[PDB]
Amino acid sequence: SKELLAEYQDLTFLTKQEILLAHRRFCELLPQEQRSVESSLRAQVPFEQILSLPELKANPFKERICRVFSTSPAKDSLSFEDFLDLLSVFSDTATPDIKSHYAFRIFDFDDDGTLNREDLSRLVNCLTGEGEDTRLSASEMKQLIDNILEESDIDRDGTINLSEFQHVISRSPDFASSFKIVL
């Protein structure tokens, strides 16, 4: 967490200065629960420390964002290796498939993989919706989703892995292209 030395496994879309700027942001994020003595490294940064700054309050996905980043147990959460691998998904450079995989992992909340077809159709629309969709564009892309539900067969199945459904949206629709951050 606090040092740049011990085994950072980061196959990532950030160069040497982008990593150093993101480390300075992680160092401003680190000290309140560990304030002066920096002891619990692969454990802090927690959700109490993410909730500490102004615009992380009425954002309903901030604990879901933290859980896809690392986490599993309470307070043992986003280490610096997790801190680079997460923002690499949103880097303006990274692929539309890794951004659609992250949109899946927000709706698939309790560990497993199999979400409901309604949460899958809401995942594709909560993207196509942010990225410039009027009433004729939303009807045309939901008629496109009805054909992607036929051959990745939804009646008989019910609960679904989006691993198949992201590779079929990587043809065109829609905000999986610009699901991105400024670093």
* Cα three-residue angle 98-103-108, rounded to 5 degrees: 115
133 is in an annotated binding site: no
CATH of the domain at 108: 1.10.238.10
Instruction: Give dist(CA 73, CA 139) in Å, integer.
Output: 41
Length of the chain: 183
174 is in an annotated binding site: no
CB count within 10 Å of CB 181 equals 12
Angle, helices 162-169 vs 135-151, to 10°: value is: 130
119 is in an annotated binding site: yes
Instruction: Give dist(CA 102, CA 70) in Å, integer.
Output: 13
Strand-strand pairing, 159-160 and 115-116: antiparallel
Cα–Cα distance list, 100 to 30, 90, 107 (Å): 29, 11, 11
Please answer whether residues 8 and 169 qualify as being in contact, where contact means their C-beta atoms are separated by less than 8 angstroms. no
Count the domains in the chain: 1
Taking phi first (over 0 means left), then psi (-120 to 50 degrees means alpha), and beta for anything else, what does residue 90 get? alpha
Does residue 131 sit in helix, strand or coil? Answer: coil
Instruction: Give dist(CA 154, CA 157) in Å, integer.
Output: 5
The experimental technique used to determine this model is NMR
Q: Which amino acid is at 1?
A: S
For residue 112, what are the domain limits? Answer: 1-183
140 is in an annotated binding site: no
Instruction: Give dist(CA 103, CA 108) in Å, integer.
Output: 9
Please answer whether residues 52 and 32 qualify as being in contact, where contact means their C-beta atoms are separated by less than 8 angstroms. yes
146 is in an annotated binding site: no
Please answer whether residues 175 and 129 qualify as being in contact, where contact means their C-beta atoms are separated by less than 8 angstroms. yes
Instruction: Give dist(CA 141, CA 174) in Å, integer.
Output: 9
Please answer whether residues 115 and 163 qualify as being in contact, where contact means their C-beta atoms are separated by less than 8 angstroms. no
Taking phi first (over 0 means left), then psi (-120 to 50 degrees means alpha), and beta for anything else, what does residue 175 get? alpha
Longest Cα–Cα distance in the chain = 58
Please answer whether residues 87 and 176 qualify as being in contact, where contact means their C-beta atoms are separated by less than 8 angstroms. no
97 is in an annotated binding site: no
Instruction: Give dist(CA 135, CA 42) in Å, integer.
Output: 47
Please answer whether residues 176 and 99 qualify as being in contact, where contact means their C-beta atoms are separated by less than 8 angstroms. yes
153 is in an annotated binding site: yes
CB count within 10 Å of CB 117 equals 15
110 is in an annotated binding site: yes
155 is in an annotated binding site: yes
**For residue 77, what are its two tokens?**
């959460």
Question: Which residues are bridge partners to 34 per DSSP?
Answer: none
